[PDB]
CSV table of C-alpha atoms in Angstrom, one decimal:
chain,number,residue,atom,x,y,z
A,1,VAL,CA,73.8,-20.4,-0.6
A,2,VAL,CA,73.0,-17.1,1.0
A,3,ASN,CA,70.2,-16.5,-1.5
A,4,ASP,CA,68.7,-20.0,-0.9
A,5,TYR,CA,68.8,-19.3,2.9
A,6,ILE,CA,67.1,-16.0,2.5
A,7,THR,CA,64.5,-17.5,0.2
A,8,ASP,CA,63.6,-20.1,2.7
A,9,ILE,CA,63.5,-17.5,5.5
A,10,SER,CA,61.2,-15.2,3.4
A,11,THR,CA,58.9,-18.1,2.7
A,12,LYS,CA,58.6,-18.9,6.4
A,13,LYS,CA,58.0,-15.2,7.0
A,14,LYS,CA,55.0,-15.1,4.6
A,15,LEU,CA,53.7,-18.3,6.2
A,16,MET,CA,53.9,-16.7,9.6
A,17,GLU,CA,52.0,-13.7,8.2
A,18,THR,CA,49.3,-16.0,7.0
A,19,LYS,CA,49.1,-17.6,10.4
A,20,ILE,CA,48.9,-14.3,12.3
A,21,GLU,CA,46.2,-13.1,10.0
A,22,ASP,CA,44.2,-16.2,10.7
A,23,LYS,CA,44.7,-15.9,14.4
A,24,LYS,CA,43.5,-12.2,14.2
A,25,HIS,CA,40.4,-13.5,12.5
A,26,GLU,CA,39.8,-16.1,15.3
A,27,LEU,CA,40.3,-13.4,17.9
A,28,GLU,CA,37.7,-11.3,16.1
A,29,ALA,CA,35.3,-14.2,16.1
A,30,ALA,CA,35.8,-14.7,19.9
A,31,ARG,CA,35.1,-11.0,20.4
A,32,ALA,CA,32.0,-11.3,18.3
A,33,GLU,CA,30.8,-14.2,20.5
A,34,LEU,CA,31.5,-12.1,23.6
A,35,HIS,CA,29.4,-9.2,22.2
A,36,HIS,CA,26.6,-11.6,21.3
A,37,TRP,CA,26.5,-13.0,24.9
A,38,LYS,CA,26.7,-9.5,26.4
A,39,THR,CA,23.8,-8.2,24.4
A,40,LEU,CA,21.6,-11.3,24.8
A,41,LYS,CA,18.6,-10.6,27.0
A,42,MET,CA,18.2,-14.1,28.5
A,43,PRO,CA,19.4,-17.6,27.6
A,44,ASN,CA,16.9,-20.1,26.3
A,45,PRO,CA,16.5,-23.9,26.5
A,46,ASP,CA,16.8,-26.1,23.4
A,47,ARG,CA,14.3,-25.1,20.7
A,48,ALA,CA,13.4,-25.9,17.1
A,49,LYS,CA,13.4,-23.1,14.4
A,50,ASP,CA,9.7,-23.7,14.0
A,51,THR,CA,9.2,-22.7,17.6
A,52,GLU,CA,11.1,-19.4,17.0
A,53,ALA,CA,9.0,-18.8,13.9
A,54,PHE,CA,5.8,-19.5,15.8
A,55,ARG,CA,6.8,-17.1,18.6
A,56,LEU,CA,7.8,-14.4,16.1
A,57,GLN,CA,4.3,-15.0,14.6
A,58,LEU,CA,2.8,-14.6,18.1
A,59,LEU,CA,4.7,-11.3,18.5
A,60,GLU,CA,3.4,-10.1,15.2
A,61,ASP,CA,-0.2,-11.1,16.0
A,62,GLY,CA,-0.1,-10.0,19.6
A,63,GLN,CA,-0.7,-13.1,21.8
A,64,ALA,CA,-0.2,-12.7,25.6
A,65,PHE,CA,2.5,-15.4,26.0
A,66,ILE,CA,5.5,-16.2,28.2
A,67,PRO,CA,7.7,-19.3,28.4
A,68,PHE,CA,7.3,-21.4,31.5
A,69,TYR,CA,10.9,-21.0,32.7
A,70,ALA,CA,10.5,-17.2,32.5
A,71,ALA,CA,7.3,-17.3,34.6
A,72,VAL,CA,8.4,-19.6,37.4
A,73,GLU,CA,10.9,-19.9,40.2
A,74,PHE,CA,11.7,-22.4,42.9
A,75,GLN,CA,11.0,-21.7,46.6
A,76,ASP,CA,14.2,-21.0,48.5
A,77,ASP,CA,14.2,-24.3,50.5
A,78,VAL,CA,14.1,-26.4,47.3
A,79,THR,CA,17.9,-27.2,47.1
A,80,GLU,CA,19.8,-26.9,43.9
A,81,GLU,CA,19.8,-30.6,43.3
A,82,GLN,CA,16.0,-30.7,43.3
A,83,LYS,CA,16.0,-27.6,41.1
A,84,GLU,CA,18.1,-29.6,38.6
A,85,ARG,CA,15.9,-32.7,38.8
A,86,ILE,CA,12.7,-30.7,38.3
A,87,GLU,CA,14.1,-28.6,35.5
A,88,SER,CA,15.4,-31.7,33.7
A,89,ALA,CA,12.0,-33.5,34.0
A,90,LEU,CA,10.2,-30.4,32.8
A,91,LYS,CA,12.6,-30.1,29.8
A,92,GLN,CA,12.0,-33.8,28.9
A,93,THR,CA,8.3,-33.2,29.1
A,94,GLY,CA,8.7,-30.0,27.1
A,95,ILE,CA,6.8,-27.9,29.7
A,96,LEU,CA,10.0,-26.0,30.7
A,97,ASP,CA,9.8,-23.9,27.5
A,98,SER,CA,6.0,-24.2,27.0
A,99,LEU,CA,4.0,-21.0,26.7
A,100,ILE,CA,1.6,-19.8,29.5
A,101,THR,CA,-1.0,-17.6,27.8
A,102,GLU,CA,-3.9,-15.6,29.4
A,103,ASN,CA,-6.0,-16.8,26.4
A,104,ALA,CA,-6.7,-20.5,25.9
A,105,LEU,CA,-4.1,-20.5,23.1
A,106,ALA,CA,-3.7,-23.4,20.7
A,107,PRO,CA,0.0,-23.5,19.7
A,108,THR,CA,1.5,-24.1,16.3
A,109,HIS,CA,4.7,-26.1,16.5
A,110,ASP,CA,4.8,-25.2,20.2
A,111,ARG,CA,3.5,-26.3,23.6
A,112,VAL,CA,0.9,-24.3,25.6
A,113,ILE,CA,-0.2,-24.9,29.2
A,114,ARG,CA,-3.7,-24.2,30.4
A,115,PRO,CA,-5.2,-24.0,33.9
A,116,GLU,CA,-6.3,-27.5,34.9
A,117,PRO,CA,-5.4,-27.8,38.6
A,118,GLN,CA,-4.8,-31.5,39.5
A,119,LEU,CA,-5.8,-31.1,43.1
A,120,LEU,CA,-5.4,-34.8,43.8
A,121,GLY,CA,-2.0,-35.6,45.2
A,122,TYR,CA,0.9,-33.1,45.4
A,123,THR,CA,1.4,-30.5,42.7
A,124,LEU,CA,4.3,-28.3,41.6
A,125,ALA,CA,2.6,-25.4,43.3
A,126,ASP,CA,4.0,-26.9,46.5
A,127,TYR,CA,7.6,-26.4,45.2
A,128,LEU,CA,7.4,-23.5,42.8
A,129,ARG,CA,6.3,-19.8,42.8
A,130,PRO,CA,5.6,-17.4,40.0
A,131,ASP,CA,8.2,-15.0,38.7
A,132,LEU,CA,6.3,-12.9,36.2
A,133,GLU,CA,8.1,-9.8,34.8
A,134,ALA,CA,7.0,-6.2,34.8
A,135,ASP,CA,5.2,-6.1,31.5
A,136,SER,CA,3.8,-9.7,31.7
A,137,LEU,CA,0.2,-9.9,30.4
A,138,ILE,CA,-0.1,-13.3,32.1
A,139,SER,CA,-1.9,-13.4,35.5
A,140,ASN,CA,-0.1,-14.7,38.6
A,141,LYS,CA,-3.2,-16.8,39.5
A,142,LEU,CA,-3.0,-18.4,36.1
A,143,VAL,CA,0.6,-19.4,36.8
A,144,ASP,CA,-0.3,-20.7,40.2
A,145,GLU,CA,-3.2,-22.8,38.9
A,146,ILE,CA,-0.9,-24.2,36.1
A,147,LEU,CA,1.5,-25.1,38.9
A,148,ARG,CA,-1.3,-26.9,40.6
A,149,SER,CA,-2.1,-28.4,37.1
A,150,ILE,CA,1.3,-30.2,37.1
A,151,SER,CA,0.7,-33.2,39.3
A,152,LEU,CA,3.5,-34.9,41.2
A,153,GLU,CA,1.6,-38.2,41.1
A,154,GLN,CA,0.1,-40.2,38.2
A,155,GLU,CA,-3.4,-41.8,37.8
A,156,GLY,CA,-3.8,-44.2,34.9
A,157,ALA,CA,-2.8,-42.3,31.7
A,158,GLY,CA,-2.2,-39.3,33.9
A,159,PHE,CA,0.2,-36.3,33.6
A,160,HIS,CA,2.7,-35.8,36.4
A,161,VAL,CA,6.2,-34.5,36.9
A,162,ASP,CA,7.8,-35.5,40.2
A,163,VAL,CA,10.7,-33.8,42.0
A,164,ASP,CA,12.8,-37.0,42.0
A,165,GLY,CA,13.3,-37.0,38.2
A,166,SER,CA,10.3,-39.1,37.3
A,167,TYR,CA,7.6,-37.9,35.0
A,168,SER,CA,4.7,-39.2,32.8
A,169,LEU,CA,2.1,-38.0,30.4
A,170,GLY,CA,-0.1,-40.8,29.1
A,171,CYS,CA,-0.3,-44.5,29.8
A,172,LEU,CA,3.5,-44.4,30.4
A,173,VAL,CA,6.2,-43.8,33.0
A,174,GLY,CA,9.3,-41.6,32.5
A,175,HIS,CA,12.5,-40.7,34.2
A,176,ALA,CA,14.9,-37.8,33.4
A,177,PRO,CA,18.6,-38.1,32.7
A,178,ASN,CA,21.3,-35.6,33.6
A,179,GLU,CA,21.5,-32.5,31.3
A,180,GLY,CA,23.3,-30.0,33.5
A,181,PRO,CA,22.3,-28.1,36.5
A,182,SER,CA,19.2,-25.8,36.7
A,183,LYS,CA,19.9,-22.9,34.4
A,184,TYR,CA,16.6,-21.4,33.3
A,185,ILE,CA,14.1,-21.7,36.2
A,186,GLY,CA,14.9,-19.1,38.8
A,187,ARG,CA,16.7,-15.7,38.5
A,188,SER,CA,20.1,-17.0,39.6
A,189,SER,CA,20.0,-20.1,37.4
A,190,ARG,CA,19.4,-18.0,34.2
A,191,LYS,CA,22.3,-15.7,35.2
A,192,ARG,CA,24.5,-18.8,35.7
A,193,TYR,CA,24.5,-19.8,32.0
A,194,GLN,CA,25.4,-16.3,30.7
A,195,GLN,CA,28.2,-16.1,33.3
A,196,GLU,CA,29.6,-19.4,32.1
B,1,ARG,CA,-5.7,-48.7,21.6
B,2,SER,CA,-4.7,-47.1,24.9
B,3,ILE,CA,-3.3,-44.0,23.1
B,4,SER,CA,-6.2,-41.8,22.1
B,5,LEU,CA,-6.3,-39.3,19.3
B,6,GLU,CA,-9.1,-37.1,20.8
B,7,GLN,CA,-9.1,-35.0,24.0
B,8,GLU,CA,-9.7,-37.1,27.1
B,9,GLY,CA,-10.8,-34.0,29.0
B,10,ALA,CA,-7.8,-32.9,31.1
B,11,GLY,CA,-6.0,-36.0,29.8
B,12,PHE,CA,-3.8,-37.5,27.0
B,13,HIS,CA,-4.4,-37.5,23.3
B,14,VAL,CA,-2.6,-36.9,20.0
B,15,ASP,CA,-4.7,-35.7,17.1
B,16,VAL,CA,-4.3,-36.8,13.4
B,17,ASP,CA,-3.1,-33.3,12.4
B,18,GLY,CA,-0.2,-33.7,14.9
B,19,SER,CA,-1.8,-31.6,17.6
B,20,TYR,CA,-1.9,-33.0,21.1
B,21,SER,CA,-3.4,-32.4,24.6
B,22,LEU,CA,-1.4,-33.8,27.5
B,23,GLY,CA,-3.0,-33.4,30.9
B,24,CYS,CA,-3.3,-29.6,31.3
B,25,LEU,CA,-1.1,-29.1,28.2
B,26,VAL,CA,-2.0,-28.6,24.5
B,27,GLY,CA,0.6,-28.7,21.8
B,28,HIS,CA,1.3,-28.8,18.1
B,29,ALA,CA,4.2,-30.4,16.4
B,30,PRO,CA,6.8,-28.8,14.0
B,31,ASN,CA,8.1,-29.8,10.6
B,32,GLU,CA,10.1,-33.1,10.8
B,33,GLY,CA,10.0,-34.2,7.1
B,34,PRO,CA,8.7,-37.5,5.8
B,35,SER,CA,8.6,-40.4,8.3
B,36,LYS,CA,12.0,-41.9,9.1
B,37,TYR,CA,11.6,-43.7,12.4
B,38,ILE,CA,8.2,-45.4,12.1
B,39,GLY,CA,8.0,-48.4,9.8
B,40,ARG,CA,10.5,-50.4,7.7
B,41,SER,CA,9.9,-48.2,4.7
B,42,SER,CA,10.7,-45.1,6.8
B,43,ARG,CA,13.9,-46.6,8.2
B,44,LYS,CA,15.0,-47.7,4.7
B,45,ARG,CA,14.3,-44.2,3.3
B,46,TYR,CA,16.3,-42.7,6.2
B,47,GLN,CA,19.3,-45.0,5.7
B,48,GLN,CA,19.4,-44.6,1.9
B,49,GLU,CA,18.9,-40.8,2.0
C,1,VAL,CA,63.3,-10.7,-8.6
C,2,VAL,CA,63.4,-14.5,-9.4
C,3,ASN,CA,63.7,-15.2,-5.6
C,4,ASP,CA,60.7,-13.0,-4.8
C,5,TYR,CA,58.7,-15.0,-7.4
C,6,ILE,CA,60.0,-18.4,-6.1
C,7,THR,CA,59.2,-17.3,-2.5
C,8,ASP,CA,55.7,-16.5,-3.5
C,9,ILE,CA,55.3,-19.9,-5.2
C,10,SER,CA,56.8,-21.7,-2.2
C,11,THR,CA,54.3,-19.9,0.1
C,12,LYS,CA,51.3,-20.9,-2.1
C,13,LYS,CA,52.7,-24.5,-2.3
C,14,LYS,CA,52.8,-24.6,1.5
C,15,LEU,CA,49.3,-23.3,1.8
C,16,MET,CA,48.2,-25.9,-0.8
C,17,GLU,CA,49.8,-28.7,1.3
C,18,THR,CA,48.0,-27.5,4.4
C,19,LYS,CA,44.6,-27.3,2.6
C,20,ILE,CA,45.3,-30.8,1.2
C,21,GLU,CA,45.6,-32.0,4.7
C,22,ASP,CA,42.4,-30.2,5.6
C,23,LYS,CA,40.5,-31.7,2.7
C,24,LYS,CA,41.8,-35.1,3.5
C,25,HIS,CA,40.4,-34.8,7.0
C,26,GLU,CA,37.1,-33.4,5.9
C,27,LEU,CA,36.7,-36.2,3.3
C,28,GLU,CA,37.7,-38.7,6.1
C,29,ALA,CA,34.8,-37.3,8.3
C,30,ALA,CA,32.5,-37.7,5.3
C,31,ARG,CA,33.8,-41.3,4.9
C,32,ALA,CA,33.1,-42.0,8.5
C,33,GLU,CA,29.5,-40.7,8.2
C,34,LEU,CA,29.0,-42.7,5.1
C,35,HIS,CA,30.3,-45.8,6.8
C,36,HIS,CA,28.0,-45.2,9.8
C,37,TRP,CA,24.9,-45.0,7.5
C,38,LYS,CA,26.2,-48.1,5.7
C,39,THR,CA,26.4,-49.8,9.1
C,40,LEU,CA,23.1,-48.4,10.3
C,41,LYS,CA,21.2,-51.0,12.3
C,42,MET,CA,18.3,-48.6,12.9
C,43,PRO,CA,17.5,-44.9,13.3
C,44,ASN,CA,18.1,-43.5,16.8
C,45,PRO,CA,15.8,-40.6,18.0
C,46,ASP,CA,17.1,-37.9,20.3
C,47,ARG,CA,18.8,-39.5,23.4
C,48,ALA,CA,21.2,-38.9,26.2
C,49,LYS,CA,24.1,-41.2,27.0
């Protein structure tokens, strides 16, 4: 009887050792994730691998490019709710992550904005201001014109992105759903995601 | 017929090669594999695969 | 010595039972996906709730 008892106890001991090893592995995985988030320069919106390949190709070739969210910021009076709505609409339209380039670049598996100010009706220039970084090859005036190029009103098959969550590009009308608060446009919003 | 496949100036179009210009925007699509959403054949291929 | 051996075998048996449960659940997830494709009315593009 004593031997059977000790046998069962030893079996459970080995089982607990397996469990503790697995939990050590999980702790190491969590620490690896913490390291990855600490080292990361800046969070990004949703993307396809083809987009990352194209942007690595751009780095190799040397195109002057920057994503929209990195080159823009809301004016202070635009409350967080409007920030969320505008960012959601831009994400649905795909302009939130599109590339602003000093050259009239034609993207491959990517979206590129170009200066075509839609001076009729309101434009995002009313609500947004540039946030170019220190080594940005893009010009501030280009970003401002592109902001003017994003209409807040639609004409026929026109392109527009309103602050109320409504957008359109083509003979169409669109509205954005909820996909979280603003997390990429603006300096604080980008910091929010990494803090989370 | 409303949807064009050539640039409408600063407008809306989607080229045959998958490139598109949308207002002030110009874009190009990524790999998505054979058609799965458009057409009965595509839907059947999607389901069976 | 015999009890060391039997303890080892019991430990590996317990791990086998645990992994049998794990494989049962993975195969059940595969079954659920197969049923969903079997019961596919149409393909759904990217969407929000």
